[PDB]
Design a protein around this ligand. Sequence first.
Ligand SMILES: [Ca+2]
Length: 559
Amino acid sequence: GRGANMPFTIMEAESTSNATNGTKLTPNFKPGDYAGEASGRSSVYLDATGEYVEFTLTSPANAFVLRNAVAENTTGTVSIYADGVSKGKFNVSSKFSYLYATPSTLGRLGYDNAPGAGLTAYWLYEDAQLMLDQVYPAGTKIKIQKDAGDVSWIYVDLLETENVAPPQANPDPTKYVAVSASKSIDQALTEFRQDNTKKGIYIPAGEWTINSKIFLYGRATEIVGAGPWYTKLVAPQSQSNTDVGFNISAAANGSTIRDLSAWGNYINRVDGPGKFIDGNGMQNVTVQNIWVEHFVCLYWGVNSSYNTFKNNRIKNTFADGINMTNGSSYNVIDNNYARGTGDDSFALFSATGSYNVGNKYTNLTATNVRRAAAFAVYGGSDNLFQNLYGADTLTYPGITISSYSFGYNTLGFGDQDTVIDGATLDRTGGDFWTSVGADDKINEYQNFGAIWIYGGDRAIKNILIKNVDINNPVYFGLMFQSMSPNNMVMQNIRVENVNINNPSRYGIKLVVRAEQGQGPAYGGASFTNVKVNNPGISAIYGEAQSPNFTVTRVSGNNW
Ligand SMILES: [Ca+2]
């Protein structure tokens, strides 16, 4: 792509291709800011009746997602036009946006949705979904316009456009027990469990309350919807933070959940509950073509292996999108799109079995990461991250590569490579933690590059980063750092075929003193065909001050 191959096209409102009589925001990298938090770091602000932004379709579309910001605690409309003719109203809302913290308490991002004395609002954008009764061809002018009776003001960030096929029917009513207006999901599963001729259940187009965690057991179960635009599992929207979804017991290893959406009711992060799918230790489970929003996570695996997560959309969550932890091995995390996660969008956390091994995170997109990284790998061995697109992180790298234990029982990285191969990272990095007594001090925070290679308290070894384009990172392209006093020696760290374009500070930073008590990096890294283009200050910082870190310029470096 790079990244996931999705049927929807992402179009930025602020494109110079888009006529507008509204106000185009100049970009910045600030959390809590309507530009800093926008995709592309810009949006078009509509603030008077008749103000519009005009998109042009580049593929046919009958369905649309409008990423937007409106006033806190409000709902209303904004209008959609096709070739100058009005066609409907988006239902725009800040029900799930505006999370409160302070600049010195960004660890609270996502945890508190209530305004309060001294608190600043963050996580300002949210989405409106709308299907129209016609497929419009490429070249159609799709105008978002503020008409009389629409909201007082709205920031228009981007538009998804998609040509959604008609809903798919029950594949076979004699094999898939249908959920219906008078037969619940649980009742259909009971009929399935008790009749061995059934393969699973079918959930038709419609809105279906999920007010519980739905347990899958007995045997491998198929759960099949009509398509994610059509089958909507809905947490009770007059409640908040209800732990609902599926929980897959061991007897239902080998299950498949596909072709549906799930609309949670979380308005803040909670730690433990809130994953749409629970499945601790699950094996051979497939989760495919589902669209989930407003949960804490889609899935947080614990010693979960041989699973497949494919073609999913994970948007506007309060922590990670998908994390696989504590022994999770041989998983296929392929062709998934995440936008607006509340912690690491796609993560792998290795802990003691010894390592998470053999995982393949491929063709992944993670954008508008509202806290932490687009992609994060914490230890492990023989894991592949391939064809990634990451962009617009609020607080942290595009890719975190870290051997910090976080206090858990882990050995760090193992004896086979952790590979990042093929990645584009646009406007990644950000501010987090504090930098009291730091070298190279530019503000009150620590400052994170597009890729952070962090040796923590465990082994940091066998890391291959290749075929990466880093465009306009907030601060740096590559940032290497060793935790003191552990000073783990970085070994077999190699960087190949990397372009670092317009970093505001440095192409490469070797962190010399992150904060009081910390020192420079230990070990070294090799660089082959790594280009640093137009750095704000200099191509590399920290090399002379890092006498125990060896930069090896193999060939092809312009620095
Ligand atoms: Ca935008």
